[PDB]
Amino acid sequence: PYLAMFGQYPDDIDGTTYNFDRCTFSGNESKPLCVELDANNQPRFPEWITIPLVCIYMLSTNILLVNLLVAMFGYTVGSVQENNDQVWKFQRFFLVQEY
């Protein structure tokens, strides 16, 4: 999910896209466990629950949240522009007196 915000889309969520080469049935390996199967040896997850969930998650993370953060940063830089100059001037005394 952390990578999902950087444009990476989960792969093991669609039966068609899912590939069994990556996964392993047992734990004696270094790749993720395979999806739970059925008596017919096919993926069992409904596939109409995961896709909308991922769509909503990606919409919330990639787009809305970053835009909100941009807005907050804009307001913050606008609000405290003048006080930052005074703070920098105050610290300039220490910076100059250091040498």
Ligand X SMILES: CC(C)CCC[C@@H](C)[C@H]1CC[C@H]2[C@@H]3CC=C4C[C@@H](OC(=O)CCC(=O)O)CC[C@]4(C)[C@H]3CC[C@]12C
Ligand Y SMILES: FC(F)(F)c1ccccc1-c1cc(C(F)(F)F)c2[nH]c(C3=NOC4(CCCCC4)C3)nc2c1
Residues that bind ligand Y (CB under 6 A): 53, 56-57, 60, 64-65, 68
Instruction: Tell me the angle at which helices 66-79 and 81-98 cross, rounded to the nearest 10 degrees.
Output: 70
52 touches, from ligand Y, ligand X, its own copies, none (C-beta below 5 to 8 Å by class): ligand X
Give CB contacts under 8 A, 24+ apart, made by 82-86.
none
- Under the binding rule (CB under 8 A), the answer on residue 75 touching its own copies is yes
Q: How far is CA 78 from CA 18, 47, 64, 69, 85, in A?
A: 48, 46, 21, 14, 13
- Under the binding rule (CB under 8 A), the answer on residue 81 touching its own copies is yes
Residue 41 beta carbon to its own copies: minimum distance, rounded to whole angstroms: 15
- Under the binding rule (CB under 6 A), the answer on residue 94 touching ligand X is no
57 touches, from ligand Y, its own copies, ligand X, none (C-beta below 5 to 8 Å by class): ligand Y
Q: Tokens standing for 31?
A: 């790749």
| Cβ atoms of 51 and 42 closer than 8 Å | no
32-61 residues near ligand X, rule: CB under 6 A: 46-49, 51-53, 55-56
Contact residues: ligand X, CB under 6 A: 2, 46-49, 51-53, 55-56
